[PDB]
mmCIF file of all heavy atoms in Angstrom:
data_model
loop_
_atom_site.group_PDB
_atom_site.id
_atom_site.type_symbol
_atom_site.label_atom_id
_atom_site.label_comp_id
_atom_site.label_asym_id
_atom_site.label_seq_id
_atom_site.Cartn_x
_atom_site.Cartn_y
_atom_site.Cartn_z
ATOM 1 N N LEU A 211 0.864 -1.168 0.000
ATOM 2 C CA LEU A 211 0.000 0.000 0.000
ATOM 3 C C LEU A 211 0.901 1.218 0.000
ATOM 4 O O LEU A 211 0.670 2.150 -0.763
ATOM 5 C CB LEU A 211 -0.921 0.019 1.239
ATOM 6 C CG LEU A 211 -2.050 -1.024 1.376
ATOM 7 C CD1 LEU A 211 -2.631 -0.922 2.782
ATOM 8 C CD2 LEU A 211 -3.146 -0.766 0.356
ATOM 9 N N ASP A 212 1.956 1.181 0.817
ATOM 10 C CA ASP A 212 2.906 2.280 0.874
ATOM 11 C C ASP A 212 3.602 2.477 -0.461
ATOM 12 O O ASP A 212 3.875 3.611 -0.848
ATOM 13 C CB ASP A 212 3.947 2.060 1.968
ATOM 14 C CG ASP A 212 4.818 3.295 2.119
ATOM 15 O OD1 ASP A 212 4.302 4.326 2.476
ATOM 16 O OD2 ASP A 212 5.993 3.218 1.860
ATOM 17 N N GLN A 213 3.924 1.380 -1.145
ATOM 18 C CA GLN A 213 4.531 1.477 -2.460
ATOM 19 C C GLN A 213 3.591 2.122 -3.468
ATOM 20 O O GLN A 213 4.040 2.957 -4.255
ATOM 21 C CB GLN A 213 4.940 0.089 -2.948
ATOM 22 C CG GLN A 213 6.110 -0.522 -2.197
ATOM 23 C CD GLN A 213 6.389 -1.950 -2.622
ATOM 24 O OE1 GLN A 213 5.505 -2.650 -3.126
ATOM 25 N NE2 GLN A 213 7.624 -2.392 -2.419
ATOM 26 N N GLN A 214 2.311 1.740 -3.454
ATOM 27 C CA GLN A 214 1.328 2.320 -4.362
ATOM 28 C C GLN A 214 1.077 3.783 -4.038
ATOM 29 O O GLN A 214 0.885 4.577 -4.955
ATOM 30 C CB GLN A 214 0.020 1.542 -4.289
ATOM 31 C CG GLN A 214 -1.048 1.934 -5.299
ATOM 32 C CD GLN A 214 -0.622 1.668 -6.729
ATOM 33 O OE1 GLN A 214 0.140 0.738 -7.007
ATOM 34 N NE2 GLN A 214 -1.125 2.474 -7.653
ATOM 35 N N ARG A 215 1.074 4.115 -2.749
ATOM 36 C CA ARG A 215 0.950 5.473 -2.239
ATOM 37 C C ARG A 215 2.031 6.327 -2.864
ATOM 38 O O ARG A 215 1.755 7.325 -3.536
ATOM 39 C CB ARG A 215 1.116 5.511 -0.725
ATOM 40 C CG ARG A 215 1.031 6.879 -0.080
ATOM 41 C CD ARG A 215 1.344 6.830 1.367
ATOM 42 N NE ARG A 215 2.732 6.518 1.665
ATOM 43 C CZ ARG A 215 3.753 7.397 1.621
ATOM 44 N NH1 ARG A 215 3.556 8.651 1.277
ATOM 45 N NH2 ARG A 215 4.956 6.962 1.943
ATOM 46 N N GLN A 216 3.271 5.910 -2.635
ATOM 47 C CA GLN A 216 4.404 6.642 -3.150
ATOM 48 C C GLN A 216 4.414 6.697 -4.670
ATOM 49 O O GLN A 216 4.838 7.709 -5.224
ATOM 50 C CB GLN A 216 5.731 6.018 -2.710
ATOM 51 C CG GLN A 216 6.087 6.124 -1.236
ATOM 52 C CD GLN A 216 7.447 5.501 -0.963
ATOM 53 O OE1 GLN A 216 8.375 5.749 -1.740
ATOM 54 N NE2 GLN A 216 7.600 4.711 0.093
ATOM 55 N N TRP A 217 4.015 5.618 -5.342
ATOM 56 C CA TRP A 217 3.959 5.616 -6.792
ATOM 57 C C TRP A 217 2.966 6.605 -7.349
ATOM 58 O O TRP A 217 3.283 7.271 -8.330
ATOM 59 C CB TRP A 217 3.620 4.240 -7.350
ATOM 60 C CG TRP A 217 3.582 4.197 -8.859
ATOM 61 C CD1 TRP A 217 4.646 4.046 -9.699
ATOM 62 C CD2 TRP A 217 2.417 4.287 -9.715
ATOM 63 N NE1 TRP A 217 4.221 4.032 -11.005
ATOM 64 C CE2 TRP A 217 2.863 4.170 -11.034
ATOM 65 C CE3 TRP A 217 1.050 4.445 -9.472
ATOM 66 C CZ2 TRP A 217 1.995 4.205 -12.115
ATOM 67 C CZ3 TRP A 217 0.178 4.487 -10.551
ATOM 68 C CH2 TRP A 217 0.639 4.367 -11.837
ATOM 69 N N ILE A 218 1.775 6.677 -6.762
ATOM 70 C CA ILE A 218 0.773 7.624 -7.225
ATOM 71 C C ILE A 218 1.342 9.031 -7.031
ATOM 72 O O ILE A 218 1.116 9.892 -7.882
ATOM 73 C CB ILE A 218 -0.586 7.417 -6.539
ATOM 74 C CG1 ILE A 218 -1.237 6.092 -6.935
ATOM 75 C CG2 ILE A 218 -1.491 8.523 -7.034
ATOM 76 C CD1 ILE A 218 -2.424 5.738 -6.067
ATOM 77 N N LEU A 219 2.029 9.274 -5.908
ATOM 78 C CA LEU A 219 2.692 10.552 -5.658
ATOM 79 C C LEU A 219 3.704 10.829 -6.757
ATOM 80 O O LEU A 219 3.831 11.956 -7.223
ATOM 81 C CB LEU A 219 3.426 10.585 -4.315
ATOM 82 C CG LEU A 219 4.135 11.911 -4.045
ATOM 83 C CD1 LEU A 219 3.100 13.025 -4.029
ATOM 84 C CD2 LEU A 219 4.868 11.826 -2.717
ATOM 85 N N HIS A 220 4.488 9.822 -7.110
ATOM 86 C CA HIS A 220 5.424 9.937 -8.207
ATOM 87 C C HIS A 220 4.715 10.323 -9.499
ATOM 88 O O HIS A 220 5.233 11.150 -10.246
ATOM 89 C CB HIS A 220 6.236 8.663 -8.407
ATOM 90 C CG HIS A 220 7.233 8.816 -9.504
ATOM 91 N ND1 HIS A 220 8.409 9.518 -9.355
ATOM 92 C CD2 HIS A 220 7.214 8.373 -10.777
ATOM 93 C CE1 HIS A 220 9.079 9.490 -10.494
ATOM 94 N NE2 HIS A 220 8.376 8.803 -11.373
ATOM 95 N N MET A 221 3.567 9.705 -9.781
ATOM 96 C CA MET A 221 2.790 10.036 -10.968
ATOM 97 C C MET A 221 2.324 11.486 -10.884
ATOM 98 O O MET A 221 2.236 12.146 -11.917
ATOM 99 C CB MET A 221 1.612 9.080 -11.112
ATOM 100 C CG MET A 221 2.031 7.655 -11.413
ATOM 101 S SD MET A 221 2.950 7.391 -12.944
ATOM 102 C CE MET A 221 1.674 7.494 -14.189
ATOM 103 N N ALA A 222 2.014 11.977 -9.680
ATOM 104 C CA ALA A 222 1.674 13.382 -9.463
ATOM 105 C C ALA A 222 2.843 14.274 -9.853
ATOM 106 O O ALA A 222 2.655 15.350 -10.421
ATOM 107 C CB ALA A 222 1.323 13.645 -8.011
ATOM 108 N N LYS A 223 4.048 13.838 -9.504
ATOM 109 C CA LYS A 223 5.255 14.563 -9.852
ATOM 110 C C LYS A 223 5.507 14.524 -11.357
ATOM 111 O O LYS A 223 6.004 15.502 -11.915
ATOM 112 C CB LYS A 223 6.446 13.976 -9.097
ATOM 113 C CG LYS A 223 6.426 14.229 -7.594
ATOM 114 C CD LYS A 223 7.635 13.595 -6.923
ATOM 115 C CE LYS A 223 7.638 13.836 -5.420
ATOM 116 N NZ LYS A 223 8.828 13.217 -4.768
ATOM 117 N N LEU A 224 5.187 13.401 -11.999
ATOM 118 C CA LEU A 224 5.311 13.281 -13.446
ATOM 119 C C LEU A 224 4.288 14.155 -14.138
ATOM 120 O O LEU A 224 4.549 14.662 -15.231
ATOM 121 C CB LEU A 224 5.128 11.836 -13.888
ATOM 122 C CG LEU A 224 6.226 10.859 -13.482
ATOM 123 C CD1 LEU A 224 5.773 9.474 -13.874
ATOM 124 C CD2 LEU A 224 7.531 11.217 -14.168
ATOM 125 N N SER A 225 3.122 14.292 -13.511
ATOM 126 C CA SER A 225 2.095 15.190 -13.988
ATOM 127 C C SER A 225 2.687 16.593 -13.966
ATOM 128 O O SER A 225 2.612 17.313 -14.959
ATOM 129 C CB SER A 225 0.840 15.047 -13.147
ATOM 130 O OG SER A 225 -0.150 15.938 -13.561
ATOM 131 N N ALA A 226 3.305 16.979 -12.851
ATOM 132 C CA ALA A 226 3.926 18.293 -12.760
ATOM 133 C C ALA A 226 4.995 18.483 -13.821
ATOM 134 O O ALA A 226 5.077 19.561 -14.412
ATOM 135 C CB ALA A 226 4.547 18.494 -11.386
ATOM 136 N N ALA A 227 5.804 17.452 -14.051
ATOM 137 C CA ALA A 227 6.858 17.511 -15.047
ATOM 138 C C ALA A 227 6.318 17.785 -16.438
ATOM 139 O O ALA A 227 6.841 18.665 -17.122
ATOM 140 C CB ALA A 227 7.640 16.207 -15.049
ATOM 141 N N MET A 228 5.284 17.053 -16.845
ATOM 142 C CA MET A 228 4.722 17.269 -18.169
ATOM 143 C C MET A 228 4.069 18.617 -18.296
ATOM 144 O O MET A 228 4.158 19.219 -19.365
ATOM 145 C CB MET A 228 3.712 16.239 -18.537
ATOM 146 C CG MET A 228 3.286 16.332 -19.992
ATOM 147 S SD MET A 228 2.050 15.103 -20.375
ATOM 148 C CE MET A 228 2.935 13.771 -19.590
ATOM 149 N N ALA A 229 3.387 19.061 -17.241
ATOM 150 C CA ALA A 229 2.759 20.369 -17.256
ATOM 151 C C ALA A 229 3.826 21.421 -17.484
ATOM 152 O O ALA A 229 3.598 22.338 -18.268
ATOM 153 C CB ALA A 229 2.013 20.624 -15.967
ATOM 154 N N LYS A 230 4.979 21.281 -16.821
ATOM 155 C CA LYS A 230 6.087 22.202 -17.019
ATOM 156 C C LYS A 230 6.615 22.141 -18.440
ATOM 157 O O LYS A 230 6.938 23.189 -18.992
ATOM 158 C CB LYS A 230 7.218 21.908 -16.038
ATOM 159 C CG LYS A 230 6.908 22.275 -14.594
ATOM 160 C CD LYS A 230 8.065 21.908 -13.677
ATOM 161 C CE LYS A 230 7.752 22.244 -12.225
ATOM 162 N NZ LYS A 230 8.872 21.875 -11.317
ATOM 163 N N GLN A 231 6.679 20.950 -19.043
ATOM 164 C CA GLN A 231 7.176 20.867 -20.411
ATOM 165 C C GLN A 231 6.190 21.538 -21.364
ATOM 166 O O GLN A 231 6.611 22.202 -22.315
ATOM 167 C CB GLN A 231 7.392 19.413 -20.847
ATOM 168 C CG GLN A 231 8.440 18.641 -20.055
ATOM 169 C CD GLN A 231 9.827 19.249 -19.994
ATOM 170 O OE1 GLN A 231 10.488 19.558 -20.987
ATOM 171 N NE2 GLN A 231 10.290 19.428 -18.763
ATOM 172 N N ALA A 232 4.894 21.374 -21.096
ATOM 173 C CA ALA A 232 3.842 21.996 -21.886
ATOM 174 C C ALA A 232 3.931 23.508 -21.753
ATOM 175 O O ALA A 232 3.711 24.215 -22.734
ATOM 176 C CB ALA A 232 2.481 21.475 -21.455
ATOM 177 N N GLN A 233 4.243 23.987 -20.542
ATOM 178 C CA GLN A 233 4.448 25.401 -20.266
ATOM 179 C C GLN A 233 5.670 25.937 -20.980
ATOM 180 O O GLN A 233 5.650 27.086 -21.411
ATOM 181 C CB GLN A 233 4.568 25.650 -18.762
ATOM 182 C CG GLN A 233 3.266 25.474 -17.997
ATOM 183 C CD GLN A 233 3.452 25.581 -16.499
ATOM 184 O OE1 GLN A 233 4.541 25.340 -15.967
ATOM 185 N NE2 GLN A 233 2.382 25.942 -15.799
ATOM 186 N N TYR A 234 6.731 25.140 -21.100
ATOM 187 C CA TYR A 234 7.912 25.600 -21.819
ATOM 188 C C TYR A 234 7.565 25.802 -23.290
ATOM 189 O O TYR A 234 8.005 26.775 -23.906
ATOM 190 C CB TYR A 234 9.043 24.581 -21.681
ATOM 191 C CG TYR A 234 9.517 24.426 -20.254
ATOM 192 C CD1 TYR A 234 10.105 23.242 -19.842
ATOM 193 C CD2 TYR A 234 9.335 25.461 -19.348
ATOM 194 C CE1 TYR A 234 10.518 23.085 -18.534
ATOM 195 C CE2 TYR A 234 9.746 25.305 -18.041
ATOM 196 C CZ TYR A 234 10.333 24.125 -17.631
ATOM 197 O OH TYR A 234 10.742 23.977 -16.327
ATOM 198 N N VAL A 235 6.751 24.896 -23.833
ATOM 199 C CA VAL A 235 6.318 25.006 -25.217
ATOM 200 C C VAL A 235 5.398 26.198 -25.422
ATOM 201 O O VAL A 235 5.579 26.939 -26.387
ATOM 202 C CB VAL A 235 5.610 23.716 -25.674
ATOM 203 C CG1 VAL A 235 5.007 23.917 -27.055
ATOM 204 C CG2 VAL A 235 6.619 22.585 -25.712
ATOM 205 N N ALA A 236 4.419 26.359 -24.535
ATOM 206 C CA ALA A 236 3.472 27.464 -24.587
ATOM 207 C C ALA A 236 4.167 28.806 -24.420
ATOM 208 O O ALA A 236 3.794 29.767 -25.093
ATOM 209 C CB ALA A 236 2.412 27.285 -23.511
ATOM 210 N N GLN A 237 5.168 28.871 -23.542
ATOM 211 C CA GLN A 237 5.923 30.094 -23.319
ATOM 212 C C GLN A 237 6.659 30.494 -24.575
ATOM 213 O O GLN A 237 6.705 31.681 -24.906
ATOM 214 C CB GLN A 237 6.924 29.901 -22.178
ATOM 215 C CG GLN A 237 7.702 31.147 -21.801
ATOM 216 C CD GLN A 237 6.816 32.243 -21.242
ATOM 217 O OE1 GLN A 237 6.044 32.027 -20.305
ATOM 218 N NE2 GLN A 237 6.924 33.435 -21.816
ATOM 219 N N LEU A 238 7.231 29.510 -25.264
ATOM 220 C CA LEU A 238 7.895 29.810 -26.511
ATOM 221 C C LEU A 238 6.953 30.106 -27.637
ATOM 222 O O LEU A 238 7.323 30.868 -28.525
ATOM 223 C CB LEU A 238 8.806 28.690 -26.920
ATOM 224 C CG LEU A 238 10.189 29.011 -26.440
ATOM 225 C CD1 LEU A 238 10.628 30.286 -27.148
ATOM 226 C CD2 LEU A 238 10.191 29.186 -24.926
ATOM 227 N N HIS A 239 5.780 29.497 -27.633
ATOM 228 C CA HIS A 239 4.778 29.823 -28.625
ATOM 229 C C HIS A 239 4.456 31.304 -28.553
ATOM 230 O O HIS A 239 4.388 31.974 -29.584
ATOM 231 C CB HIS A 239 3.483 29.042 -28.383
ATOM 232 C CG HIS A 239 2.409 29.391 -29.366
ATOM 233 N ND1 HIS A 239 2.401 28.916 -30.660
ATOM 234 C CD2 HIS A 239 1.319 30.183 -29.246
ATOM 235 C CE1 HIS A 239 1.345 29.397 -31.293
ATOM 236 N NE2 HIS A 239 0.672 30.175 -30.461
ATOM 237 N N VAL A 240 4.216 31.779 -27.329
ATOM 238 C CA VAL A 240 3.930 33.181 -27.089
ATOM 239 C C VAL A 240 5.095 34.064 -27.485
ATOM 240 O O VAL A 240 4.871 35.079 -28.141
ATOM 241 C CB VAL A 240 3.577 33.413 -25.614
ATOM 242 C CG1 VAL A 240 3.492 34.906 -25.334
ATOM 243 C CG2 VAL A 240 2.245 32.743 -25.315
ATOM 244 N N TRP A 241 6.309 33.689 -27.081
ATOM 245 C CA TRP A 241 7.514 34.423 -27.440
ATOM 246 C C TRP A 241 7.666 34.531 -28.943
ATOM 247 O O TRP A 241 8.027 35.595 -29.450
ATOM 248 C CB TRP A 241 8.732 33.743 -26.837
ATOM 249 C CG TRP A 241 10.030 34.428 -27.128
ATOM 250 C CD1 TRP A 241 11.064 33.967 -27.889
ATOM 251 C CD2 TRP A 241 10.435 35.734 -26.652
ATOM 252 N NE1 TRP A 241 12.085 34.887 -27.906
ATOM 253 C CE2 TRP A 241 11.718 35.972 -27.153
ATOM 254 C CE3 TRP A 241 9.820 36.703 -25.850
ATOM 255 C CZ2 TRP A 241 12.404 37.143 -26.879
ATOM 256 C CZ3 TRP A 241 10.510 37.879 -25.577
ATOM 257 C CH2 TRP A 241 11.769 38.092 -26.077
ATOM 258 N N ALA A 242 7.415 33.422 -29.638
ATOM 259 C CA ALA A 242 7.478 33.381 -31.082
ATOM 260 C C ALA A 242 6.439 34.324 -31.663
ATOM 261 O O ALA A 242 6.738 35.076 -32.583
ATOM 262 C CB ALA A 242 7.266 31.967 -31.600
ATOM 263 N N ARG A 243 5.218 34.339 -31.139
ATOM 264 C CA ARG A 243 4.267 35.302 -31.681
ATOM 265 C C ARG A 243 4.632 36.748 -31.376
ATOM 266 O O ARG A 243 4.354 37.636 -32.184
ATOM 267 C CB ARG A 243 2.863 35.055 -31.175
ATOM 268 C CG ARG A 243 2.186 33.842 -31.774
ATOM 269 C CD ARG A 243 0.772 33.765 -31.342
ATOM 270 N NE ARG A 243 0.110 32.636 -31.956
ATOM 271 C CZ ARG A 243 -0.382 32.663 -33.211
ATOM 272 N NH1 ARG A 243 -0.277 33.744 -33.950
ATOM 273 N NH2 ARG A 243 -0.974 31.599 -33.715
ATOM 274 N N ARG A 244 5.227 37.000 -30.214
ATOM 275 C CA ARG A 244 5.632 38.354 -29.883
ATOM 276 C C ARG A 244 6.774 38.883 -30.728
ATOM 277 O O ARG A 244 6.775 40.058 -31.098
ATOM 278 C CB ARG A 244 6.062 38.445 -28.424
ATOM 279 C CG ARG A 244 4.955 38.340 -27.390
ATOM 280 C CD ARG A 244 5.504 38.415 -26.012
ATOM 281 N NE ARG A 244 4.457 38.367 -25.003
ATOM 282 C CZ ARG A 244 4.670 38.383 -23.673
ATOM 283 N NH1 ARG A 244 5.896 38.451 -23.203
ATOM 284 N NH2 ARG A 244 3.646 38.332 -22.838
ATOM 285 N N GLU A 245 7.748 38.032 -31.031
ATOM 286 C CA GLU A 245 8.884 38.487 -31.810
ATOM 287 C C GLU A 245 8.796 38.265 -33.313
ATOM 288 O O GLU A 245 9.316 39.086 -34.074
ATOM 289 C CB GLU A 245 10.140 37.829 -31.258
ATOM 290 C CG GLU A 245 10.471 38.218 -29.828
ATOM 291 C CD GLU A 245 10.770 39.684 -29.633
ATOM 292 O OE1 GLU A 245 11.335 40.304 -30.505
ATOM 293 O OE2 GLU A 245 10.425 40.194 -28.593
ATOM 294 N N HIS A 246 8.178 37.175 -33.753
ATOM 295 C CA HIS A 246 8.101 36.880 -35.178
ATOM 296 C C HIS A 246 7.245 37.946 -35.828
ATOM 297 O O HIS A 246 6.235 38.331 -35.236
ATOM 298 C CB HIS A 246 7.421 35.529 -35.442
ATOM 299 C CG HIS A 246 7.591 35.041 -36.835
ATOM 300 N ND1 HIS A 246 6.837 35.483 -37.899
ATOM 301 C CD2 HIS A 246 8.473 34.150 -37.331
ATOM 302 C CE1 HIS A 246 7.253 34.884 -38.998
ATOM 303 N NE2 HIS A 246 8.249 34.076 -38.684
ATOM 304 N N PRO A 247 7.631 38.469 -36.998
ATOM 305 C CA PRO A 247 6.825 39.416 -37.722
ATOM 306 C C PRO A 247 5.410 38.886 -37.871
ATOM 307 O O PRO A 247 5.188 37.717 -38.199
ATOM 308 C CB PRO A 247 7.615 39.525 -39.023
ATOM 309 C CG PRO A 247 9.041 39.271 -38.590
ATOM 310 C CD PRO A 247 8.979 38.211 -37.523
ATOM 311 N N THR A 248 4.442 39.748 -37.605
ATOM 312 C CA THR A 248 3.054 39.330 -37.631
ATOM 313 C C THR A 248 2.492 39.439 -39.018
ATOM 314 O O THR A 248 3.106 40.042 -39.898
ATOM 315 C CB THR A 248 2.204 40.192 -36.693
ATOM 316 O OG1 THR A 248 2.215 41.537 -37.178
ATOM 317 C CG2 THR A 248 2.788 40.159 -35.290
ATOM 318 N N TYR A 249 1.312 38.877 -39.224
ATOM 319 C CA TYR A 249 0.720 38.980 -40.539
ATOM 320 C C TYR A 249 0.344 40.440 -40.774
ATOM 321 O O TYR A 249 0.320 40.873 -41.919
ATOM 322 C CB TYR A 249 -0.439 38.044 -40.730
ATOM 323 C CG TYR A 249 -0.696 37.878 -42.201
ATOM 324 C CD1 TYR A 249 0.281 37.212 -42.918
ATOM 325 C CD2 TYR A 249 -1.839 38.342 -42.831
ATOM 326 C CE1 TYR A 249 0.126 37.002 -44.265
ATOM 327 C CE2 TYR A 249 -1.998 38.124 -44.189
ATOM 328 C CZ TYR A 249 -1.021 37.456 -44.903
ATOM 329 O OH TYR A 249 -1.169 37.207 -46.250
ATOM 330 N N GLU A 250 0.002 41.181 -39.713
ATOM 331 C CA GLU A 250 -0.281 42.610 -39.823
ATOM 332 C C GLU A 250 0.978 43.363 -40.270
ATOM 333 O O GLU A 250 0.865 44.389 -40.940
ATOM 334 C CB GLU A 250 -0.785 43.164 -38.489
ATOM 335 C CG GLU A 250 -2.167 42.671 -38.085
ATOM 336 C CD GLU A 250 -2.610 43.202 -36.749
ATOM 337 O OE1 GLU A 250 -1.821 43.838 -36.093
ATOM 338 O OE2 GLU A 250 -3.739 42.971 -36.386
ATOM 339 N N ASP A 251 2.163 42.861 -39.903
ATOM 340 C CA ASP A 251 3.411 43.444 -40.394
ATOM 341 C C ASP A 251 3.542 43.134 -41.877
ATOM 342 O O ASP A 251 4.080 43.957 -42.616
ATOM 343 C CB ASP A 251 4.632 42.918 -39.626
ATOM 344 C CG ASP A 251 4.736 43.457 -38.208
ATOM 345 O OD1 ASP A 251 4.776 44.652 -38.041
ATOM 346 O OD2 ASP A 251 4.723 42.662 -37.294
ATOM 347 N N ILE A 252 3.032 41.978 -42.310
ATOM 348 C CA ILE A 252 3.049 41.629 -43.724
ATOM 349 C C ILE A 252 2.097 42.546 -44.476
ATOM 350 O O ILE A 252 2.419 42.976 -45.583
ATOM 351 C CB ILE A 252 2.647 40.164 -43.969
ATOM 352 C CG1 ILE A 252 3.635 39.266 -43.235
ATOM 353 C CG2 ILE A 252 2.620 39.868 -45.457
ATOM 354 C CD1 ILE A 252 5.068 39.504 -43.611
ATOM 355 N N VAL A 253 0.937 42.830 -43.879
ATOM 356 C CA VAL A 253 -0.038 43.753 -44.442
ATOM 357 C C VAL A 253 0.595 45.124 -44.610
ATOM 358 O O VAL A 253 0.384 45.755 -45.641
ATOM 359 C CB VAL A 253 -1.296 43.845 -43.556
ATOM 360 C CG1 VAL A 253 -2.182 44.977 -44.050
ATOM 361 C CG2 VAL A 253 -2.062 42.532 -43.614
ATOM 362 N N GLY A 254 1.329 45.587 -43.596
ATOM 363 C CA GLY A 254 2.068 46.843 -43.664
ATOM 364 C C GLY A 254 3.081 46.818 -44.807
ATOM 365 O O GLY A 254 3.218 47.795 -45.540
ATOM 366 N N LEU A 255 3.802 45.708 -44.972
ATOM 367 C CA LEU A 255 4.742 45.568 -46.083
ATOM 368 C C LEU A 255 4.038 45.594 -47.442
ATOM 369 O O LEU A 255 4.636 46.006 -48.435
ATOM 370 C CB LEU A 255 5.540 44.263 -45.953
ATOM 371 C CG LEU A 255 6.556 44.211 -44.807
ATOM 372 C CD1 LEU A 255 7.135 42.808 -44.690
ATOM 373 C CD2 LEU A 255 7.648 45.222 -45.099
ATOM 374 N N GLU A 256 2.810 45.093 -47.518
ATOM 375 C CA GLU A 256 2.059 45.182 -48.762
ATOM 376 C C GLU A 256 1.454 46.566 -49.018
ATOM 377 O O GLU A 256 1.448 47.030 -50.159
ATOM 378 C CB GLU A 256 0.938 44.139 -48.774
ATOM 379 C CG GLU A 256 1.421 42.697 -48.862
ATOM 380 C CD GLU A 256 0.301 41.694 -48.888
ATOM 381 O OE1 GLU A 256 -0.834 42.083 -48.733
ATOM 382 O OE2 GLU A 256 0.580 40.533 -49.070
ATOM 383 N N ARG A 257 0.933 47.220 -47.978
ATOM 384 C CA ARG A 257 0.319 48.537 -48.130
ATOM 385 C C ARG A 257 1.289 49.701 -48.258
ATOM 386 O O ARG A 257 1.014 50.651 -48.993
ATOM 387 C CB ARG A 257 -0.600 48.827 -46.955
ATOM 388 C CG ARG A 257 -1.878 48.006 -46.917
ATOM 389 C CD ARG A 257 -2.709 48.352 -45.735
ATOM 390 N NE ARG A 257 -3.961 47.614 -45.716
ATOM 391 C CZ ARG A 257 -4.865 47.663 -44.719
ATOM 392 N NH1 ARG A 257 -4.641 48.415 -43.665
ATOM 393 N NH2 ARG A 257 -5.975 46.952 -44.800
#
């Protein structure tokens, strides 16, 4: 029971780990949109 207890806790920690990896991706997605020229910048280049 103690082993299963600790294992589920470990899975909780793995949950945290993946959430953090998803956050690293999301953070860069946002960074990429903030720095990458926007389509509105493309519109400006056309107009």
Side-chain angles (χ1 to χ4, degrees):
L211 291 170
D212 187 63
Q213 290 174 336
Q214 187 64 31
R215 179 186 68 80
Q216 291 182 44
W217 181 83
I218 293 168
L219 180 60
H220 182 76
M221 293 299 284
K223 291 179 180 180
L224 292 174
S225 178
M228 189 181 313
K230 289 178 181 179
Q231 297 304 305
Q233 289 174 335
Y234 296 154
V235 173
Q237 184 65 53
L238 265 297
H239 178 77
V240 171
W241 181 247
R243 287 186 178 279
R244 289 179 178 178
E245 296 297 326
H246 193 280
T248 64
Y249 199 68
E250 291 178 354
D251 288 303
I252 300 304
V253 171
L255 290 173
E256 292 181 354
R257 289 180 178 175

